[PDB]
Amino acid sequence: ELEAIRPYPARTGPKGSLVYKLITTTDHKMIGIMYCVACISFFFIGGLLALLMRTELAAPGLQFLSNEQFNQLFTMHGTIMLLFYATPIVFGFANLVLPLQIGAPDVAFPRLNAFSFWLFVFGATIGAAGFITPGGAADFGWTAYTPLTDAIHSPGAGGDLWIMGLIVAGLGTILGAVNMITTVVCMRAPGMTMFRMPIFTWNIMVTSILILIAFPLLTAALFGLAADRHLGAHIYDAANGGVLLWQHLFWFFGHPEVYIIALPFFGIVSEIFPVFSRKPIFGYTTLVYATLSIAALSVAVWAHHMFATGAVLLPFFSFMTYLIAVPTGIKFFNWIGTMWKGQLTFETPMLFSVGFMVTFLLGGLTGVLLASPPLDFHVTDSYFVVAHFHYVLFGTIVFATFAGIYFWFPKMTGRLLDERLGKLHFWLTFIGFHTTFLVQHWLGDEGMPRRYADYLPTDGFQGLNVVSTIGAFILGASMFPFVWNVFKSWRYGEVVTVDDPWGYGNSLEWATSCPPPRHNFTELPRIRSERPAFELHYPHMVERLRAEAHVG
Amino acid sequence: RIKPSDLGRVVKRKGQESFNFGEFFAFTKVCSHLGCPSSLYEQQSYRILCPCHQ
Amino acid sequence: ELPPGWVLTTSGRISGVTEPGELSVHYPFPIADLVALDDALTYSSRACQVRFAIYLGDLGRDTAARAREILGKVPTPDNAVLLAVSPNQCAIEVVYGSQVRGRGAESAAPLGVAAASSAFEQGELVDGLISAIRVLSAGIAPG
Amino acid sequence: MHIEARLFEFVAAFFVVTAVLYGVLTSMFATGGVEWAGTTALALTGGMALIVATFFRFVARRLDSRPEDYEGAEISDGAGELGFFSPHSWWPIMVALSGSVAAVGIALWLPWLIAAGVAFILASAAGLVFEYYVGPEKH
Amino acid sequence: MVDVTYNGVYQPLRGVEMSRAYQSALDISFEVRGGLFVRQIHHWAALMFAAAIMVHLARIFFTGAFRRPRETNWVIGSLLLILAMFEGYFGYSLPDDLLSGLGLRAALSSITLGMPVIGTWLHWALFGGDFPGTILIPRLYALHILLLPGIILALIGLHLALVWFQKHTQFPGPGRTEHNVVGVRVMPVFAFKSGAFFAAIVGVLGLMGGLLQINPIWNLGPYKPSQVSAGSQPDFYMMWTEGLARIWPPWEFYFWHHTIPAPVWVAVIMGLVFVLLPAYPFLEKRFTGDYAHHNLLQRPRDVPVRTAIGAMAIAFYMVLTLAAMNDIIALKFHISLNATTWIGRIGMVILPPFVYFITYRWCIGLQRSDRSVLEHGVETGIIKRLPHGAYIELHQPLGPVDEHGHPIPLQYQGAPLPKRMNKLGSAGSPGSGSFLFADSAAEDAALREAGHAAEQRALAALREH
Amino acid sequence: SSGKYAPDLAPANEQQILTAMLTGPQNMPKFSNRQLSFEAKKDIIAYVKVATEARQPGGYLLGGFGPAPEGMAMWIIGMVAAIGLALWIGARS
Amino acid sequence: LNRPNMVSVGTIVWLSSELMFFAGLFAFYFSARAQAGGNWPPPPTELNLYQAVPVTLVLIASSFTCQMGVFAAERGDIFGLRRWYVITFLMGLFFVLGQAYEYRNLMSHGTSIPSSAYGSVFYLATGFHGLHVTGGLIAFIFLLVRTGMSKFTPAQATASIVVSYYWHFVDIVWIALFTVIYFIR
Amino acid sequence: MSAMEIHLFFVGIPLLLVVVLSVLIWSRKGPHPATYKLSEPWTHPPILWAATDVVGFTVGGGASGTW
Amino acid sequence: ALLLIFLFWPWEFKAADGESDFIYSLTTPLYGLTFGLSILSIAIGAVLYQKRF
Numbered sequence A: 001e002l003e004a005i006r007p008y009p010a011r012t013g014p015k016g017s018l019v020y021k022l023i024t025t026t027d028h029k030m031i032g033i034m035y036c037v038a039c040i041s042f043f044f045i046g047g048l049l050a051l052l053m054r055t056e057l058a059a060p061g062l063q064f065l066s067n068e069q070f071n072q073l074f075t076m077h078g079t080i081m082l083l084f085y086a087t088p089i090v091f092g093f094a095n096l097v098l099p100l101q102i103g104a105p106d107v108a109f110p111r112l113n114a115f116s117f118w119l120f121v122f123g124a125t126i127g128a129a130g131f132i133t134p135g136g137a138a139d140f141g142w143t144a145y146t147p148l149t150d151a152i153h154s155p156g157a158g159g160d161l162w163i164m165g166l167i168v169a170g171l172g173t174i175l176g177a178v179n180m181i182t183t184v185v186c187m188r189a190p191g192m193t194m195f196r197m198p199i200f201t202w203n204i205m206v207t208s209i210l211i212l213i214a215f216p217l218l219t220a221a222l223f224g225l226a227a228d229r230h231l232g233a234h235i236y237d238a239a240n241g242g243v244l245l246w247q248h249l250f251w252f253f254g255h256p257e258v259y260i261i262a263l264p265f266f267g268i269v270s271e272i273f274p275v276f277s278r279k280p281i282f283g284y285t286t287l288v289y290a291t292l293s294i295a296a297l298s299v300a301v302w303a304h305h306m307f308a309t310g311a312v313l314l315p316f317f318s319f320m321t322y323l324i325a326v327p328t329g330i331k332f333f334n335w336i337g338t339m340w341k342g343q344l345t346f347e348t349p350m351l352f353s354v355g356f357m358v359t360f361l362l363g364g365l366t367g368v369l370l371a372s373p374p375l376d377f378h379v380t381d382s383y384f385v386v387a388h389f390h391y392v393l394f395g396t397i398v399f400a401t402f403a404g405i406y407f408w409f410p411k412m413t414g415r416l417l418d419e420r421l422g423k424l425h426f427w428l429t430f431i432g433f434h435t436t437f438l439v440q441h442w443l444g445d446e447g448m449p450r451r452y453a454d455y456l457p458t459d460g461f462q463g464l465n466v467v468s469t470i471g472a473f474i475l476g477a478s479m480f481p482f483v484w485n486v487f488k489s490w491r492y493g494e495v496v497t498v499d500d501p502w503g504y505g506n507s508l509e510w511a512t513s514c515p516p517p518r519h520n521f522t523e524l525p526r527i528r529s530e531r532p533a534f535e536l537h538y539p540h541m542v543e544r545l546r547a548e549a550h551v552g
Numbered sequence B: 001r002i003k004p005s006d007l008g009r010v011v012k013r014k015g016q017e018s019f020n021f022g023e024f025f026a027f028t029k030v031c032s033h034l035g036c037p038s039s040l041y042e043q044q045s046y047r048i049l050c051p052c053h054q
Numbered sequence C: 001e002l003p004p005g006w007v008l009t010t011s012g013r014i015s016g017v018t019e020p021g022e023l024s025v026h027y028p029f030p031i032a033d034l035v036a037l038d039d040a041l042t043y044s045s046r047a048c049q050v051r052f053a054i055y056l057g058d059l060g061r062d063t064a065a066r067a068r069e070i071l072g073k074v075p076t077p078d079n080a081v082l083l084a085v086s087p088n089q090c091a092i093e094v095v096y097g098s099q100v101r102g103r104g105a106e107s108a109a110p111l112g113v114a115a116a117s118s119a120f121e122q123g124e125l126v127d128g129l130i131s132a133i134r135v136l137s138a139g140i141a142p143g
Numbered sequence D: 001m002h003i004e005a006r007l008f009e010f011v012a013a014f015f016v017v018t019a020v021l022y023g024v025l026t027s028m029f030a031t032g033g034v035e036w037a038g039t040t041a042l043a044l045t046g047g048m049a050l051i052v053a054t055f056f057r058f059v060a061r062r063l064d065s066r067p068e069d070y071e072g073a074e075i076s077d078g079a080g081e082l083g084f085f086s087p088h089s090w091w092p093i094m095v096a097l098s099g100s101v102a103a104v105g106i107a108l109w110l111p112w113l114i115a116a117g118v119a120f121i122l123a124s125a126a127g128l129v130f131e132y133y134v135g136p137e138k139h
Numbered sequence E: 001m002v003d004v005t006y007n008g009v010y011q012p013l014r015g016v017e018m019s020r021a022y023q024s025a026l027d028i029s030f031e032v033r034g035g036l037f038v039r040q041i042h043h044w045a046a047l048m049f050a051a052a053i054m055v056h057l058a059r060i061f062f063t064g065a066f067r068r069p070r071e072t073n074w075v076i077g078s079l080l081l082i083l084a085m086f087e088g089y090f091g092y093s094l095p096d097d098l099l100s101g102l103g104l105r106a107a108l109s110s111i112t113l114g115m116p117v118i119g120t121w122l123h124w125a126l127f128g129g130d131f132p133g134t135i136l137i138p139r140l141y142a143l144h145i146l147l148l149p150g151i152i153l154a155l156i157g158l159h160l161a162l163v164w165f166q167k168h169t170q171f172p173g174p175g176r177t178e179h180n181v182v183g184v185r186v187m188p189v190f191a192f193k194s195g196a197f198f199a200a201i202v203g204v205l206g207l208m209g210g211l212l213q214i215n216p217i218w219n220l221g222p223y224k225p226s227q228v229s230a231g232s233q234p235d236f237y238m239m240w241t242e243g244l245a246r247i248w249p250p251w252e253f254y255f256w257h258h259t260i261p262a263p264v265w266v267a268v269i270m271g272l273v274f275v276l277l278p279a280y281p282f283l284e285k286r287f288t289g290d291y292a293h294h295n296l297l298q299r300p301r302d303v304p305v306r307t308a309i310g311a312m313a314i315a316f317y318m319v320l321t322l323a324a325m326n327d328i329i330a331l332k333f334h335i336s337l338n339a340t341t342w343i344g345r346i347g348m349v350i351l352p353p354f355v356y357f358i359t360y361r362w363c364i365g366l367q368r369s370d371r372s373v374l375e376h377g378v379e380t381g382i383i384k385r386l387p388h389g390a391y392i393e394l395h396q397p398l399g400p401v402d403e404h405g406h407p408i409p410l411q412y413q414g415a416p417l418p419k420r421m422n423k424l425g426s427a428g429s430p431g432s433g434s435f436l437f438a439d440s441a442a443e444d445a446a447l448r449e450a451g452h453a454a455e456q457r458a459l460a461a462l463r464e465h
Numbered sequence F: 001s002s003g004k005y006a007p008d009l010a011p012a013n014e015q016q017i018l019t020a021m022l023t024g025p026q027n028m029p030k031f032s033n034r035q036l037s038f039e040a041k042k043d044i045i046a047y048v049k050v051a052t053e054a055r056q057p058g059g060y061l062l063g064g065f066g067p068a069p070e071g072m073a074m075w076i077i078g079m080v081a082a083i084g085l086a087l088w089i090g091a092r093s
Numbered sequence G: 001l002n003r004p005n006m007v008s009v010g011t012i013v014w015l016s017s018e019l020m021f022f023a024g025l026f027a028f029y030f031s032a033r034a035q036a037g038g039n040w041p042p043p044p045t046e047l048n049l050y051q052a053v054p055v056t057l058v059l060i061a062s063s064f065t066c067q068m069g070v071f072a073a074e075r076g077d078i079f080g081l082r083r084w085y086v087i088t089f090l091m092g093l094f095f096v097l098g099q100a101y102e103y104r105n106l107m108s109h110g111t112s113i114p115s116s117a118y119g120s121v122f123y124l125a126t127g128f129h130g131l132h133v134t135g136g137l138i139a140f141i142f143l144l145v146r147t148g149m150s151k152f153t154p155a156q157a158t159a160s161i162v163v164s165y166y167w168h169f170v171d172i173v174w175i176a177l178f179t180v181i182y183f184i185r
Numbered sequence H: 001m002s003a004m005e006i007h008l009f010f011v012g013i014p015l016l017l018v019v020v021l022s023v024l025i026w027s028r029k030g031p032h033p034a035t036y037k038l039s040e041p042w043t044h045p046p047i048l049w050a051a052t053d054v055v056g057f058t059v060g061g062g063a064s065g066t067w
Numbered sequence I: 001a002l003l004l005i006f007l008f009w010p011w012e013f014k015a016a017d018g019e020s021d022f023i024y025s026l027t028t029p030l031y032g033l034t035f036g037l038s039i040l041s042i043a044i045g046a047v048l049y050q051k052r053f
């Protein structure tokens, strides 16, 4: 025995070991890593945008910024957040784990993955390059209503760049979803059945289905808008019904654009619960049924953004939305029943999950409150809905993304992040977020609609904005400890070679070496249930697992 | 011919106080940079542009 | 006997797991210190083109015999210099290889042994090993 | 794969039900009568799911049982040679660069640059297609 | 340069005082059958010449053929480049329109008059007094037709003779060595290919000349000191001088009744650029301490330092050239003129090190990839299930194989190697049909076996010898 | 300089041309009928309409700019076709 | 191995996305059609029925020839495949020249893109169809060039088949659009 | 307002909480074991390290020592 | 074709807006097109003959 091993692995590696490999790549894992890096960078850009926002909004009156710059500013903030961070991070986690989760040696179309990645990067660079224009980028908000987006108003070049960036990003997303669907449907492990795969795969495939259902309509809409702007095609003229038509189509596309960014991270939290709960998933087939029900009905509730227009039939869409509320509650009940009466250990990923369910609970309560038409007749366009979507979107995406990173960092790099810095980061982000985004209900229900550059000293709320600014500034510096921890642990830190650093893992992923070689596999175990690695590592526990599977 | 409205932000270069005449200045044309003639004047910005090298 | 968590696979590879709250090295040394010694080892091995190994176990037997028995575990025993330290019995030894002879090997063992021994009385061992490896690498000439 | 076909046909049925209900409910009790905008989208997404399920059923009805479709199968059953996969390559980044150039051209109205972008797109597509079919140089 | 009246055929230019040379140019453009075609061909050919010489110099610099045996060839090439650039500058100035007049006025007058010591003497000698002279245009015409073309032709003949006597280099290969040359003889191939290439280049010149309008002087006007506009940015092979003039900060020195203007720094920079071009081989040979003969070139990825310096130079030239096109950048793309000027100014300093480091890393990575593909067989892109549960690449060995089936490591000889299976003969040469109808099977089989035998015989003859 | 630019006169119509000169819009020098004769305006608009609406007798036009687009065209068309013909005629080894 | 073909499902979902793109186009067209009463087409417009039907017959004949090429394709014959694909390519080129001539005729008699809403929506609907037909011709050219440069493999047959039913989908959407426009009106 | 007496809150509120959390958390104990002491016996199992840099049993020397 | 177009083409200036010429602008493009196509076809024939015979 007495095997010879290095005291440490290579910190950075040999010189010039990243550039050409990145350029001429075919590996899905590093593509997902690049996705994550680009998402982090765009998150930083938008975050500094928002910090400039909240420091301008406080101290009533125009201190150092003009109105048109402010308008362009929330245009860019909303666009970057909605269509250049979450959508690429979805495909990032896809490329990271989905071929690994299924057990497939490789993706269906390796070329198409790099194609989509580079298309998205180029589209983001083109769209974000509107600040160099002396007239600036587009001035309308991300809603992009009918009459302000024609040639008559906003004739600057920013709108064209915005539209083309959106088009390129949508095409890249379509190609990525097609790749994911093909890889899932065609390739699979030989002993693998569709009724035995982790819930994350079901969520990602229904998400890709919704992608293919939704995105092309945006492409047609933006082609028509560009045709109107450059040729005067009279498509969206006020003399016609284009005012209602464009809104109908745009909302029909964009409401699934936020429903697509919830299911995969629901799957992420669903697969992160059992490893720390030491219990099987709760309501497996029920979870699949609820996911399917959400996916199908997530497309016929688009009109509930039309309450203020008063030209659509209210009760039908109200009833549809109240129906779509139930399956989310079913998912939540499954998650909470999974961890009931268990040996739960408090580490960074499950703490982030706890914050996730807290924030999502509050956001869902606000949303189910929002569904009332007469209530929206007073609370629409106020800060109440602003807090609504901020709560839901941030609480799911940021928290689940950081939890998944904390989870799967050893799988991709073979190193473990420090837990003290993670706990400090989680606490500081949580404190800042519930401190800066709690009071806007009080500011919102009373008169203060969204997207205002100024107000008057006669009205109150001269201190609520101050509290919001304090909390936002606190949240702004909370990201730095995470960056320092990641940068330190990428080269230094604890090195793990034994499989499954978080013991009692599942989802077939913990049966291979922590540094995954090319094609990701050298051996395959038996497939008998949804926890194959767990049975492999503890073969003496099969009889007990099969015996008490229906106690209830 | 400058607008008679402002007539208050001029500088009257140290040795040429009386050279100007009301709404008249009569500047030369050969630019001192390379000698390219400059004929690009904006009335609102009071800026003279040299087309050869901006 | 396949410690809980370690299971033999179909091939010769062994898959092992660990409780999340624990590590997989259990080395009672500072991280930066181990990084520094590894850097010194690598930057000396690349220059000298000779494998160098460090052993910190006990040799409660004939030290020369045990040390020469261990050298077989080197990937290339023919060209390698092994330094072994036994803290319990205070044994410091250095051994040679077949190919690494006449390249300053003889003129390096006494100096490195003296340096390590002199650096071992103040309570530290890692800096002593670093100094010994540096002086022997300087003594060793390519050939 | 039959499970996937069943799911797709269920989605098609749900889309058809939603489309017909919306159409009949918008025919009456509407200020503007037929909406004529969302009805088309619902109808054709239902048609999409219908044709996809039909293609899957046609594939299913003329195919044998694969090991992954048979529970209890062993690993050596799937032993064999899989499809061809492209190793390290760099054409897609050039294709994406050409596409970005074309997008920039169609952004700001410059017909010469859009023509150049179209030509570059054609060249990049040609390079992508022939990357694994050009033989040795004839010399 | 005596003023005359047009009274020709172009109605929008009738009855305007104008120079005689511009009238002659208009006559050539409009009143002679096909004259405009010929002059457009001439201008397009001059641009072709400039681009071709630039590309050839770049390829020579990359291949590293400038070593001890052929240094004088490099010096002659530098002289050729400088003289050709000056001749091209004198080219577009004879039809003294607003564009040419403005360009020559600015460049020549400002640079010559800005000389610190001599200054006015050179300008007065060249122009015969003040800037607008009656002898300037005839002198420029004579210099453009007689002295520079003859000197250029003689020097080109000298360069061709030198490359004829000293045998041409060759890339490393299977049957290539530092004491022999591999190629083809003259009679059956070499001259015929040269003639075909000449015909093809004349064809592309004629086509693109007939399609693209160039220098529409009639749209312009006769040169006068009082007319000026955004018309700037002369021909693109001396555009770097204009960009350097644009981006330079305004530093000036004032001592006793004297003043040195900013453009003197531009003159110093262009003179140093002129000096460095022929002096590079001496610097390299006295820096690296190499005094060995070489008949074999090196592939670009082998030498990182020289490639990095080349990237340095080309990036500097590109950023300087694009800076001078600032106005069109701000026009076509709505960008601030001052912002673009500042971007160019800062980039001239900050961009070079970034691209230098990036290309150094790129060359190192290329060398690493070549070593990796040398170590193992080239990837076939095929995976196997391995019923025990593994996945393998199934490398195709390029030569000797050990007892284990893993090919033994080869050695690098500076020779290119295929990176794709289809590059080597695996499966090709489909049926003998032309486009719709197949041929007899015996004929196709005979053609296939004959081609395989011929290629194998050629490869064996090259490898053995 | 600094943002605003000079628009192309292609979409300009003669009445608006004369009126715009006489009006003095933003960044444009205002012109009085006293300093410029009416015949001068007629000649100016006649020349403007003739110059742009007349077919260029030199083939395809290249934007009316200087030689920078000409050099771009040389680099993108002449170079590409020339190197393609060189590769077709020559061989790689 | 690989009882199904991943190229098949990939092309199926890609055509599904394009079908939703045409769904969006149909949504643009049908909107505001009822907003005009009586003669909702502008009088300065009159569709030529004598020229629209021939191009539809051309396209359906091309689709049938493409199906014949497929039938030649599943068996070991490449030359008949090339002949059928060349016939289909020529037929589609004739079609393309057909709508180009129709385009030239239409604008010459009033209605243009900036003229009327009906003209704009009709032009927008037909332009994407024409562009996709041109893309299909490009795909034909690329595929036929690929056939003659190497050996025959099932991958080539898969590419031919997927291009074939992409063309069939193009034919179906074209006939649907024709029925919408020239018949229902 | 831009007054310093009210900008003090915006400046110092994050720093005080950051300091409190730092002294509460970072001051705790990490899982890294302490440095091995020479007086303490070598309870750790025997360990060896190899450079594994050069890519490609007989004894020709020896040494000894007792500190 | 080049010989014919050189002999019998209207090359005298008549360009204006009163009459639609549409032909005077097509002299130099036609000359260049014919010349380039002729000599390029010659070069293509030469290179093909060399490479196949």
Ligand code: HEA
Pocket: A143, A258, A259, A261, A262, A304, A305, A321, A325, A326, A328, A329, A330, A332, A360, A361, A363, A364, A365, A367, A368, A370, A371, A372, A376, A379, A380, A381, A385, A388, A389, A392, A393
């Ligand atoms: C990630 C993004 C995200 C998510 C997940 C959601 C989730 C929900 N949203 Fe939100 N929404 C947006 C982003 C999001 N939304 C955006 C960006 C806008 C407008 C953008 C713009 O116009 O500027 C918007 C606008 C918006 C409006 C219209 C506001 C306006 O235009 O005036 C409404 C109201 O109908 C609404 C409702 C809901 C509901 C009911 C949910 C539900 O999914 C959540 C409810 C979940 C719960 C947790 C309930 C679970 C069930 C139970 C626990 C059982 C008990 C429940 C009851 C009491 C019945 N959203």
Ligand code: HEA
Pocket: A043, A044, A045, A046, A047, A048, A050, A051, A053, A054, A074, A075, A077, A078, A081, A082, A086, A141, A142, A143, A393, A394, A397, A398, A450, A451, A452, A472, A475, A476, A477, A479
């Ligand atoms: C995922 C989506 C997402 C995310 C993560 C965020 C993150 C944040 N948002 Fe944003 N926001 C939206 C989506 C999002 N937002 C949307 C959709 C709207 C409205 C849409 C519309 O109306 O048009 C909106 C609007 C919005 C408004 C109101 C805009 C308006 O009404 O005028 C405000 C301010 O009250 C705000 C604040 C914040 C803050 C403080 C964060 C914080 O969470 C961010 C913390 C991050 C950091 C601050 C990064 C740190 C920055 C630096 C330290 C960079 C420094 C380093 C460099 C120099 C490189 N957001």
Ligand code: FES
Pocket: B031, B032, B033, B034, B035, B036, B037, B038, B050, B051, B052, B053, B054
């Ligand atoms: S002469 Fe004025 S900028 Fe050159």
